């Protein structure tokens, strides 16, 4: 999964996925 693949994901996904790394 690339950062661009991530950049295409819905807003909730941006939060949820970055939540794993601890951005949210």
mmCIF file of N, CA, C and O in Angstrom:
data_model
loop_
_atom_site.group_PDB
_atom_site.id
_atom_site.type_symbol
_atom_site.label_atom_id
_atom_site.label_comp_id
_atom_site.label_asym_id
_atom_site.label_seq_id
_atom_site.Cartn_x
_atom_site.Cartn_y
_atom_site.Cartn_z
ATOM 1 N N UNK A 1 0.824 -1.186 0.000
ATOM 2 C CA UNK A 1 0.000 0.000 0.000
ATOM 3 C C UNK A 1 0.863 1.243 0.000
ATOM 4 O O UNK A 1 1.627 1.495 0.942
ATOM 5 N N UNK A 2 0.758 2.000 -1.055
ATOM 6 C CA UNK A 2 1.529 3.192 -1.221
ATOM 7 C C UNK A 2 0.854 4.401 -0.548
ATOM 8 O O UNK A 2 -0.355 4.363 -0.217
ATOM 9 N N UNK A 3 1.626 5.460 -0.344
ATOM 10 C CA UNK A 3 1.124 6.706 0.217
ATOM 11 C C UNK A 3 0.121 7.371 -0.720
ATOM 12 O O UNK A 3 -0.780 8.089 -0.276
ATOM 13 N N UNK A 4 0.259 7.106 -2.004
ATOM 14 C CA UNK A 4 -0.678 7.590 -2.979
ATOM 15 C C UNK A 4 -1.987 6.818 -2.890
ATOM 16 O O UNK A 4 -3.057 7.398 -3.020
ATOM 17 N N UNK A 5 -1.903 5.519 -2.609
ATOM 18 C CA UNK A 5 -3.098 4.699 -2.433
ATOM 19 C C UNK A 5 -3.885 5.222 -1.251
ATOM 20 O O UNK A 5 -5.111 5.315 -1.285
ATOM 21 N N UNK A 6 -3.147 5.605 -0.231
ATOM 22 C CA UNK A 6 -3.685 6.215 0.971
ATOM 23 C C UNK A 6 -4.306 7.561 0.658
ATOM 24 O O UNK A 6 -5.369 7.872 1.143
ATOM 25 N N UNK A 7 -3.653 8.329 -0.189
ATOM 26 C CA UNK A 7 -4.114 9.664 -0.561
ATOM 27 C C UNK A 7 -5.435 9.622 -1.342
ATOM 28 O O UNK A 7 -6.065 10.650 -1.567
ATOM 29 N N UNK A 8 -5.823 8.445 -1.776
ATOM 30 C CA UNK A 8 -7.077 8.253 -2.504
ATOM 31 C C UNK A 8 -8.177 7.767 -1.582
ATOM 32 O O UNK A 8 -9.340 7.662 -1.986
ATOM 33 N N UNK A 9 -7.826 7.468 -0.351
ATOM 34 C CA UNK A 9 -8.791 6.946 0.598
ATOM 35 C C UNK A 9 -9.657 8.052 1.187
ATOM 36 O O UNK A 9 -9.220 9.218 1.265
ATOM 37 N N UNK A 10 -10.907 7.703 1.602
ATOM 38 C CA UNK A 10 -11.852 8.657 2.207
ATOM 39 C C UNK A 10 -11.283 9.300 3.469
ATOM 40 O O UNK A 10 -10.354 8.761 4.078
ATOM 41 N N UNK A 11 -11.859 10.421 3.879
ATOM 42 C CA UNK A 11 -11.358 11.200 5.016
ATOM 43 C C UNK A 11 -11.301 10.387 6.291
ATOM 44 O O UNK A 11 -10.327 10.473 7.039
ATOM 45 N N UNK A 12 -12.329 9.599 6.537
ATOM 46 C CA UNK A 12 -12.358 8.764 7.729
ATOM 47 C C UNK A 12 -11.193 7.778 7.710
ATOM 48 O O UNK A 12 -10.614 7.473 8.735
ATOM 49 N N UNK A 13 -10.815 7.344 6.511
ATOM 50 C CA UNK A 13 -9.722 6.422 6.352
ATOM 51 C C UNK A 13 -8.421 7.088 6.614
ATOM 52 O O UNK A 13 -7.505 6.483 7.118
ATOM 53 N N UNK A 14 -8.347 8.342 6.285
ATOM 54 C CA UNK A 14 -7.143 9.109 6.508
ATOM 55 C C UNK A 14 -6.905 9.219 7.992
ATOM 56 O O UNK A 14 -5.803 9.051 8.465
ATOM 57 N N UNK A 15 -7.976 9.407 8.720
ATOM 58 C CA UNK A 15 -7.903 9.535 10.157
ATOM 59 C C UNK A 15 -7.618 8.198 10.785
ATOM 60 O O UNK A 15 -6.685 8.062 11.556
ATOM 61 N N UNK A 16 -8.389 7.209 10.395
ATOM 62 C CA UNK A 16 -8.321 5.878 10.961
ATOM 63 C C UNK A 16 -6.966 5.233 10.738
ATOM 64 O O UNK A 16 -6.398 4.616 11.649
ATOM 65 N N UNK A 17 -6.416 5.434 9.569
ATOM 66 C CA UNK A 17 -5.164 4.812 9.215
ATOM 67 C C UNK A 17 -4.008 5.528 9.846
ATOM 68 O O UNK A 17 -3.068 4.903 10.348
ATOM 69 N N UNK A 18 -4.064 6.840 9.842
ATOM 70 C CA UNK A 18 -3.039 7.616 10.523
ATOM 71 C C UNK A 18 -3.152 7.472 12.040
ATOM 72 O O UNK A 18 -2.188 7.698 12.765
ATOM 73 N N UNK A 19 -4.330 7.101 12.512
ATOM 74 C CA UNK A 19 -4.566 6.812 13.922
ATOM 75 C C UNK A 19 -3.670 5.658 14.375
ATOM 76 O O UNK A 19 -3.183 5.664 15.488
ATOM 77 N N UNK A 20 -3.412 4.708 13.470
ATOM 78 C CA UNK A 20 -2.550 3.547 13.769
ATOM 79 C C UNK A 20 -1.116 3.995 14.066
ATOM 80 O O UNK A 20 -0.449 3.454 14.949
ATOM 81 N N UNK A 21 -0.655 4.999 13.340
ATOM 82 C CA UNK A 21 0.674 5.527 13.542
ATOM 83 C C UNK A 21 0.656 6.550 14.687
ATOM 84 O O UNK A 21 1.666 6.801 15.348
ATOM 85 N N UNK A 22 -0.501 7.115 14.925
ATOM 86 C CA UNK A 22 -0.665 8.017 16.028
ATOM 87 C C UNK A 22 -0.704 9.470 15.632
ATOM 88 O O UNK A 22 -0.177 10.323 16.348
ATOM 89 N N UNK A 23 -1.273 9.759 14.484
ATOM 90 C CA UNK A 23 -1.454 11.139 14.060
ATOM 91 C C UNK A 23 -2.756 11.675 14.592
ATOM 92 O O UNK A 23 -2.887 12.854 14.875
ATOM 93 N N UNK A 24 -3.717 10.807 14.699
ATOM 94 C CA UNK A 24 -5.007 11.161 15.231
ATOM 95 C C UNK A 24 -5.260 10.382 16.500
ATOM 96 O O UNK A 24 -5.831 9.296 16.474
#
